[PDB]
UniProtKB/Swiss-Prot annotation:
Name of the gene: mgt
Chief location: membrane
GO CC, one annotated term: outer membrane-bounded periplasmic space
Pathway it works in: Cell wall biogenesis; peptidoglycan biosynthesis
Domain of life, source organism: Bacteria
Subcellular compartments: Cell membrane
Protein name: Monofunctional glycosyltransferase
EC number: 2.4.99.28
């Protein structure tokens, strides 16, 4: 029956076609990972899925958020998509507060900044702001960017420490963040 429960769960898994993730690209504020500064992707990876590039957690997060056994869907996203694709789906379909489900809509909305390194038309997103938007995605619901508590600040302090530990930012970048943050 634990064989027979693995398989029936797998049938249900296949209802959910993984080609559908492609439609996240069609959104007006979409921005791919390929166009995001190193350290913005780092904010995200270092907090949720340290080893996102080497594994085969972000891919499961992607699945839960678009459709909802999530493991089976997850396997399949990995056969069909490169890592930067998967990462873009993540970042363009998650709750950042105040009705923002894209990284860029979030960033534009709280901060007047952009997450697209190629832009010359709007101010670029700061490491601190990156850490803030990263900290929120799986933060408790009360955690609010428009008025950060000390609990929330703690979570972003920790986001930041992780960025610096996994080398997405340097000592300058990091004490500059910790300073704007206090």
């Amino acid at each position: 029956i634990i064989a027979l429960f693995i398989g029936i769960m797998y049938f249900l898994s296949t209802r959910d076609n993984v080609d559908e993730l492609r439609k996240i690209e069609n959104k007006s504020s979409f921005v791919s990972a390929d166009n995001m500064p190193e350290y913005v992707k780092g904010a995200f990876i270092s907090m949720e899925d340290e080893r996102f590039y080497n594994h085969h957690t972000i891919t499961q997060q992607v699945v839960k958020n678009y459709f909802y056994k999530e493991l089976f869907v997850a396997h399949r996203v990995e056969k069909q998509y490169n890592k930067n694709e998967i990462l873009s789906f993540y970042l363009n379909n998650i709750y950042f507060g105040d009705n923002q489900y894209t990284l860029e809509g979030a960033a534009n909305h709280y901060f007047g900044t952009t997450v697209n390194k190629n832009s010359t038309t709007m101010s670029h997103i700061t490491v601190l702001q990156s850490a803030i938007l990263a900290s929120k995605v799986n933060a408790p619901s009360v955690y609010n960017i428009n008025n950060m508590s000390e609990n929330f600040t703690q979570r972003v302090s920790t986001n930041l420490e992780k960025m610096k530990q996994q080398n997405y930012i340097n000592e300058t970048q990091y004490q500059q963040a910790m300073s704007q943050l206090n």
